[PDB]
Subunit: 137 residues, 2 copies
């Protein structure tokens, strides 16, 4: 009931001067745009550069917390939209082990995408969001 | 070892107009200023305000991950300074020495302490070498 997606670009909405994630939807030529805050966009911009920093930023520290508790990002789902807000699930995998070892966590789309970018974990978008909110470019 | 601290104040430096966290060192009249980024300062402000939001911000997400994995923030330690950089430890307690030391920036660790109520500690080296002892005249200037 959901399509694989990826970060195509992090654009700027020069009208609202705000960052816009453009998710590609696999199986389509449509994209789903998601508006995020400035600090979120900066963190995603840095994550997508995939470069080395001498000190852990917040999402890095999240990922270190997961690692320490023998878990990892399994996937990310952008599933719902109400009142201009997309709702995401960070699906975490408990590595103490069999598929019921997945934990769903409420997340904003920004945080989820950033963690998926950092980890290589898959992003999914629900059919319904694609049907109703994906766009052509 | 180390001294208990609390966030006395978060403000924009009145010259560089960037955030500085003044930590108070309990049991003293000393404070430790730590300069942080614009985004970290906003996150800390929201946390200090105990701002209630419909959606989880990044630090909230981290704390829900902790909770999901049966763990809590235990305490936070600002322990070293190297080339203008403070180094911290996020100490996590596995609720299932079940304590875990995780390297942190001071910003993140102070944010997570403020949100959870976990104690902030500063090492005696930092206090001895970097804290400053305020006179009332200097506290009034900050206030
Ligand atoms: Cl978001
Ligand atoms: Cl910092």
């Amino acid at each position: 009931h959901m399509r694989k997606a990826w970060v195509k670009t992090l654009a700027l909405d020069r009208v609202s001067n705000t960052p816009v994630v453009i998710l590609g939807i696999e199986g389509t030529n449509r994209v789903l745009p998601i508006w995020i805050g400035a600090c979120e966009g900066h963190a995603l911009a840095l994550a997508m550069e995939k470069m080395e920093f001498p000190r852990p930023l917040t999402h890095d520290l999240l990922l270190s917390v997961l690692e320490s508790l023998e878990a990892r990002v399994d996937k990310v789902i952008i599933h719902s939209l109400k009142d201009n807000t997309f709702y995401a699930t960070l699906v975490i995998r408990d590595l103490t082990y069999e598929e019921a070892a997945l934990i769903d966590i409420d997340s904003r789309p920004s945080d989820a995408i950033i963690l998926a970018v950092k980890t290589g974990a898959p992003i999914f978008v629900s059919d319904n969001l694609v049907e109703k909110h994906s766009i052509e470019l």
